[PDB]
Swiss-Prot record, chain C:
The keyword Zinc does not apply. Pfam families: Ribosomal_S10. GO terms for molecular function: structural constituent of ribosome; transcription antitermination factor activity, RNA binding; tRNA binding. SMART domains: Ribosomal_S10. This is Small ribosomal subunit protein uS10. GO terms for cellular component: cytoplasm; cytosol; cytosolic small ribosomal subunit; small ribosomal subunit; transcription elongation factor complex. Part of the 30S ribosomal subunit. Can also form a heterodimer with the transcription antitermination protein NusB. Binding of S10 to NusB is mutually exclusive with its incorporation into the ribosome. The rRNA transcription and antitermination complex (rrnTAC) consists of RNAP, NusA, NusB, NusE (this protein), NusG, SubB, ribosomal protein S4, DNA and precursor rRNA; S4 is more flexible than other subunits. It comes from the Bacteria. Keywords: Ribonucleoprotein, Ribosomal protein, Ribosome biogenesis, RNA-binding, Transcription, Transcription antitermination, Transcription regulation.
Curated annotation (Swiss-Prot), chain D:
The gene is rpsS. InterPro entries: Ribosomal_uS19, Ribosomal_uS19_bac-type, Ribosomal_uS19_CS, Ribosomal_uS19_SF. Part of the 30S ribosomal subunit. Binds S13 and L5 and cross-links to the A site tRNA. This is Small ribosomal subunit protein uS19. The keyword rRNA-binding applies. It comes from Escherichia coli (strain K12). In the E.coli 70S ribosome in the initiation state it has been modeled to contact the 23S rRNA of the 50S subunit forming part of bridge B1a; this bridge is broken in the model with bound EF-G. The 23S rRNA contact site in bridge B1a is modeled to differ in different ribosomal states, contacting alternately S13 or S19. In the 3.5 angstroms resolved ribosome structures the contacts between L5, S13 and S19 bridge B1b are different, confirming the dynamic nature of this interaction. Bridge B1a is not visible in the crystallized ribosomes due to 23S rRNA disorder. Protein S19 forms a complex with S13 that binds strongly to the 16S ribosomal RNA. Contacts the A site tRNA. Coiled coil: none annotated. Pfam families: Ribosomal_S19. SUPFAM superfamilies: Ribosomal protein S19 (SSF54570). One of its GO terms (biological process) is ribosomal small subunit assembly. GO terms for cellular component: cytoplasm; cytosol; cytosolic small ribosomal subunit. GO terms for molecular function: rRNA binding; structural constituent of ribosome; tRNA binding. It comes from the Bacteria. Keywords: Ribonucleoprotein, Ribosomal protein, RNA-binding, rRNA-binding, tRNA-binding.
UniProtKB/Swiss-Prot annotation, chain F:
This is Small ribosomal subunit protein uS3. The keyword Membrane does not apply. Part of the 30S ribosomal subunit. Forms a tight complex with proteins uS10 and uS14. With proteins uS4 and uS5 encircles the mRNA as it enters the ribosome, which may play a role in mRNA helicase processivity. Some nascent polypeptide chains are able to cross-link to this protein in situ. In collided ribosomes contacts ribosome rescue factor SmrB. InterPro entries: KH_dom, KH_dom-like_a/b, KH_dom_type_2, KH_sf_prok-type, Ribosomal_S3_C_sf, Ribosomal_uS3_bac-typ, Ribosomal_uS3_C, Ribosomal_uS3_CS. It comes from Escherichia coli (strain K12). The lineage of its organism: Bacteria, Pseudomonadati, Pseudomonadota, Gammaproteobacteria, Enterobacterales.
From Swiss-Prot, chain G:
GO terms for biological process: cytoplasmic translation. Located at the top of the head of the 30S subunit, it contacts several helices of the 16S rRNA. In the E.coli 70S ribosome in the initiation state was modeled to contact the 23S rRNA (bridge B1a) and protein L5 of the 50S subunit (bridge B1b), connecting the 2 subunits; bridge B1a is broken in the model with bound EF-G, while the protein-protein contacts between S13 and L5 in B1b change. The 23S rRNA contact site in bridge B1a is modeled to differ in different ribosomal states, contacting alternately S13 or S19. In the two 3.5 angstroms resolved ribosome structures the contacts between L5, S13 and S19 bridge B1b are different, confirming the dynamic nature of this interaction. One of its GO terms (cellular component) is cytoplasm. Disulfide bonds: none annotated. GO terms for molecular function: rRNA binding; structural constituent of ribosome; tRNA binding. Pfam families: Ribosomal_S13. HAMAP family: Ribosomal_uS13. Changing residue 104 to H: In PW095; partially suppresses a rimM deletion. The keyword RNA-binding applies. The gene is rpsM. It comes from Escherichia coli (strain K12). This is Small ribosomal subunit protein uS13.
RNA sequence: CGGUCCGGCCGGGAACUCAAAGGAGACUGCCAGUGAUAAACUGGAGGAAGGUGGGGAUGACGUCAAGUCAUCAUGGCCCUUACGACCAGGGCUACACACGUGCUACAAUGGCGCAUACAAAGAGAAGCGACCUCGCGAGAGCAAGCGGACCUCAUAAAGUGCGUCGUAGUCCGGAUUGGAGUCUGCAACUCGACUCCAUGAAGUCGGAAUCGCUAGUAAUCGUGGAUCAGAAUGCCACGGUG
């Protein structure tokens, strides 16, 4: 992927742990408590003022070397092409071609 | 079947009367790999056929089968651009397999309330030789006697 | 009470060789040793497209076999505890100590 | 469509609706907020809702309450 | 001592125990009729007790795990025959002829890449 | 047609892994990127130091890098002068403490990666590809190789139409899993593009 | 037999006979027979005039037949005069719920013409 | 076997099922026929397995200047206060049509209601989430266990038993649309999935033409996974009947 597209992801990770990990979660659980504040909360309104990129759902899983947003595998943090390349060199531990 | 010369798979006999011929029949009727519901239709048809024809459940099947059983059939062959129908004498094993297949197919094409009723009334029509299944042996006969010169 | 050792490794001829070390070290230094118990292997399978672009039917199929070994040592003798603690095991074998 | 736990509205547009009530009806309100739910405090106003290129002015009626602002601004040109 | 024989077919695994006297059949603490709702599945377990005579001659305590109706019924059939040879060993000749000694190695074939099933290939289009 | 990777297909049969560590789904991705990042640093730094293979194992919360090299003296330096500066930044990249081992490559003309990199470095010096290939084959065969195959792909000698040329001597049974086949790649970044070098060395069965 | 909306339910079982009314499906028909104290597997024969009027009073609670028909039509016409996306699609005889129009939209479009 | 809350549940037992490391076994080896006394084939014995036992991986020299400069890398060229870069809204989802691949059907070998027997293989801590409680329901609140042969996803469905419908555009089929909701997510108008109530299209088995599959296969029936906040009739994988 593009250098700018890779940079856009770093910003999306940095903002995700800054807000929506220790602050925005507190106002979302608060916007769910039925026992306290049923009309006057403003928490749904104050969640909007927070940066858009701060949401973890806005982050895209990309190949950690190439930046590829498609064909990703969470187990290796890589795309199918770079998974295969590392697999054939024996750089992925315990991984080999399987048959059954 | 070009080089490899294979035989035939010997199937287990009928769980009711120990007949291998009935086991071929239940399998021919069988659809979607539902053997339990396939023998249920064959036995209910045989129970309603023997009762309404004077017992002998195995023999009442054989009377209906003797009428649908073909003697000769045509084989499609292209010699010199033209398609010639060569009449060939059918083997005793396939004689029964075609007879059973046409009974099941003619009962499927019927308009009765159930498959057990459709099968029973098809076997009743075959025993007296006046149905869709006996006409399939009749059409096969007229086709063979026509191309009798190319035998 | 009892000392439970759970062993994990991607190589089988490395897990039961490092398990052989634990079983022998404990039974020699005088301790009641249950096992080596061979628990089920967790086979994580992965299917990846082999071509950089198009060619859907052309694929590579891999697996990671996670071998499981259970070593239960009944007698927690000081001669056994100290012998097992200062043991040099294969770097690719994970050891879980359960009290 | 959405969970009954609070209808959605953008704060920037909500403050624009409040400013239009007290100061009186002005020219079309230029907003890109197509996701916002129409509230009763909008009936009578002219909200210029974006379609991707232009701001479609929509005269807010009592029956438009509950619906989204983007329902009255066609996004695709078909002839 | 109990005469034992292991039997298996497909993903099913059956254990068969033989003790003389009566014609009792107990499958997973349940009756033969109570466990199998099909009479065809009931007859295949009765098959080893045809060539080798039994009406009220010997009892059988059986347990089966995995597979299905015919898988479990097929597994027990193989187990009884293995528990019958455990009791005599001269019964082999009668058991071979019927084909009950043979473990049916037919397992369900794996789904292959680019194929709809194990062999079923997706529909071909020329143009 | 297309051939299976000779190293990949032999993993577990007759060929070892270059990464032997164990990790759960949790840190497996993080460890794999750290492995790439450490290999990248060392390959760049020890480029002239003839590095053939890099082995990475993780004993508990540590990193044990084994640099297989045909020139250990340049890798080690003046009484550990160069090992210390490498270990210091490997520990920085990995996070966990670092330990570097140096394995000697005896006969480098029998090492696929060192033969491939030799042909690649030669092509970049403007050496004739046929000469570079013939020398690689001759050197391996005289030193006891049971067989060798060397391929050179793309714009050979600066030619407009790219060609794939190969030299083979001895036995190269690529279908025998039992066969010790050492396979590796290298890319020659020439003034007229990229030239790919593929080397196969048969060392005997079992 | 004659219940609420002029229609004449057949001499079939009670639950399926009541589904003949526009506005009463499987759930409403089951709820109507449970509130009136009538069995579901009983026909129109034996069901006297004293049992019919108690079902008529029960079915009268929800908007059925012509009363429901105009209620559905009014909500469609409301969207249309409103000028919303939903109304523009009821006006253009194309799928309202977001479904694809590139292919397969034949229920709303009607049979194709070259 | 000892003890019963009749649950392997607790002492125990290492028998068995199973788990997973090592090992044996099948080679036309034996017998017979055919065959140039050869190769080989055919049949039979023994055997769990018989003639490469079943399935997979494995794809020679080469062919199509075949596909990929948009995974990545890279020669040359081109933009470089723009072909770069940031943002909001929109589009990739448009709809007279045509073709390819699929799903669901047209039903009594079936629909529905109740009762009920038998799987395999996977996934899981920013996670799988029991039990309890509330809601017709999608769900919600409360809150155990489990980094897992222990806990959870998770009730397998076909099937079987009984009852009903009785060849009807139907108790078949579910499209489309109206009303009300649930959840994920800053946010479900364009353009999410699912539920409740109502609606009940076409379709009664498909012209010319055409495809897959040789055995645990086809056919049919459920189950799980990768990607993934959410979004499978696709894909990958699993067993049941057969
Ligand atoms: Mg780049
Ligand atoms: Mg996403
Ligand atoms: Mg109705
Ligand atoms: Mg073994
Ligand atoms: Mg081979
Ligand atoms: Mg071209
Ligand atoms: Mg229905
Ligand atoms: Mg074949």
């Amino acid at each position: 992927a593009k250098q700018s597209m890779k940079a856009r992801e770093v910003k999306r990770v940095a903002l995700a742990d800054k807000y929506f990990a220790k602050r925005a979660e507190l106002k979302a659980i608060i916007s769910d408590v039925n026992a306290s504040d049923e009309d006057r909360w403003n928490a749904v309104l104050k969640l909007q003022t927070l940066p858009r990129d701060s949401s973890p759902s806005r982050q895209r899983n990309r190949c950690r070397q190439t930046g590829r947003p498609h064909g990703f595998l969470r187990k290796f943090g890589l795309s199918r092409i770079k998974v295969r390349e590392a697999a054939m060199r024996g750089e992925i531990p315990g991984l080999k071609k399987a048959s059954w | 079947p070009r080089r490899r010369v294979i035989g035939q798979r010997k199937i287990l006999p009928d769980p009711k009367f120990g007949s291998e011929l009935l086991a071929k029949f239940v399998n021919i009727l069988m659809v979607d790999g539902k053997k339990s519901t396939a023998e249920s239709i064959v036995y209910s048809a045989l129970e309603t056929l023997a009762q309404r024809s004077g017992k002998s459940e195995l023999e009442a099947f054989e009377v209906a089968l003797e009428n649908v059983r073909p003697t000769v059939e045509v084989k499609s062959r292209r010699v010199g651009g033209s398609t010639y129908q060569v009449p060939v004498e059918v083997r005793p094993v396939r004689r029964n397999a075609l007879a059973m297949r046409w009974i099941v197919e003619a009962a499927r094409k019927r308009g009765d309330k159930s498959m057990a009723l459709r099968l029973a009334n098809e076997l009743s029509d075959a025993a007296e030789n006046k149905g869709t299944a006996v006409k399939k042996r009749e059409d096969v006969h007229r086709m063979a006697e026509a191309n009798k010169a190319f035998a | 009470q009892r000392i439970r050792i759970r062993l994990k490794a991607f190589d089988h001829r490395l897990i039961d060789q490092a398990t052989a070390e634990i079983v022998e070290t404990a039974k020699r230094t005088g301790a009641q040793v249950r096992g080596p118990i061979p628990l089920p292997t967790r086979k994580e399978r992965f299917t990846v497209l082999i071509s950089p672009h198009v060619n859907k039917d052309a694929r590579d199929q891999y697996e990671i076999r996670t071998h499981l070994r259970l070593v239960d040592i009944v007698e927690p003798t000081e001669k056994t505890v100290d012998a097992l603690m200062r043991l040099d095991l294969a770097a690719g074998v994970d050891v879980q100590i359960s009290l | 469509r959405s969970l009954k736990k609070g209808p959605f509205i953008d704060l920037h547009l909500l403050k624009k609706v409040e400013k239009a009530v007290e100061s009186g009806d002005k020219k079309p309100l230029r907003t890109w907020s197509r996701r916002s739910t129409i509230f009763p405090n909008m009936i009578g106003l002219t909200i210029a809702v974006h379609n991707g290129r232009q701001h479609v002015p929509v005269f807010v009626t009592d029956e438009m309450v509950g619906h989204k602002l983007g329902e009255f601004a066609p996004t695709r040109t078909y002839r | 001592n109990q005469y034992y024989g292991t039997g298996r077919r497909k993903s099913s695994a059956a254990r068969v125990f033989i003790k003389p006297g009566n014609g009792k059949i107990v499958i997973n603490q349940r009756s033969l009729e109570q466990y199998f709702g099909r009479e065809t599945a009931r007859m295949v377990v009765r098959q080893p007790l045809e060539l080798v005579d039994m009406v009220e001659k010997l009892d059988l305590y059986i347990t089966v795990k995995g597979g299905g109706i015919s898988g479990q019924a097929g597994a027990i059939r193989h187990g009884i025959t293995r528990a019958l040879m455990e009791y005599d060993e001269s019964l082999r000749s009668e058991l071979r002829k019927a084909g009950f000694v043979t473990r049916d190695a037919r397992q369900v074939e794996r789904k292959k890449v680019g194929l709809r099933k194990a062999r079923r290939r997706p529909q071909f289009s020329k143009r | 047609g297309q051939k299976v990777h000779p190293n990949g297909i032999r993993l577990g049969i007759v060929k070892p892994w270059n990464s032997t560590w164990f990790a759960n789904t949790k840190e497996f991705a993080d460890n794999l990127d750290s492995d790439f990042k450490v290999r990248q640093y060392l390959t760049k730094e020890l480029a002239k130091a003839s590095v053939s293979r890099i082995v990475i194992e993780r004993p508990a919360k540590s990193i044990r890098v084994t640099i297989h090299t045909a020139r250990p003296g340049i890798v080690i330096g003046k009484k550990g002068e160069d090992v210390e500066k490498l270990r210091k930044v490997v520990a920085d990249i990995a996070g966990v403490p670092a330990q570097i081992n140096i394995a000697e490559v005896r006969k480098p003309e029998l090492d696929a990666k060192l033969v491939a990199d030799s042909i690649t470095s030669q092509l970049e010096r403007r050496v004739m590809f046929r000469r570079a290939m013939k020398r690689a084959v001759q050197n391996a065969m005289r030193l006891g190789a049971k067989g060798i195959k060397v391929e050179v792909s793309g714009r050979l000698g600066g030619a407009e139409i790219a060609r794939t040329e190969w030299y083979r001597e001895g036995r190269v049974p690529l279908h025998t899993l039992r066969a010790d086949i050492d396979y590796n790649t290298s890319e020659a970044h020439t003034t007229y593009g990229v030239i790919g070098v593929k080397v196969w060395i048969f060392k005997g069965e079992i | 037999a004659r219940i609420a909306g002029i229609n004449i339910p057949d001499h079939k079982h009670a639950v399926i006979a009541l589904t003949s009314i526009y506005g009463v499906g499987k759930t409403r028909s089951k709820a109507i027979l449970a509130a009136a104290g009538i069995a579901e597997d009983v026909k129109i024969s034996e069901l006297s005039e004293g049992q019919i009027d108690t079902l008529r009073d029960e079915v009268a609670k929800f908007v059925v037949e012509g009363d429901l028909r105009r209620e559905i039509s009014m909500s469609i016409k409301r969207l249309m005069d409103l000028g919303c996306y939903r109304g523009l699609r009821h006006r253009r005889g194309l799928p309202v719920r977001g479904q694809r129009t590139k292919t397969n939209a034949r229920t709303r479009k009607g049979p194709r013409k070259p």
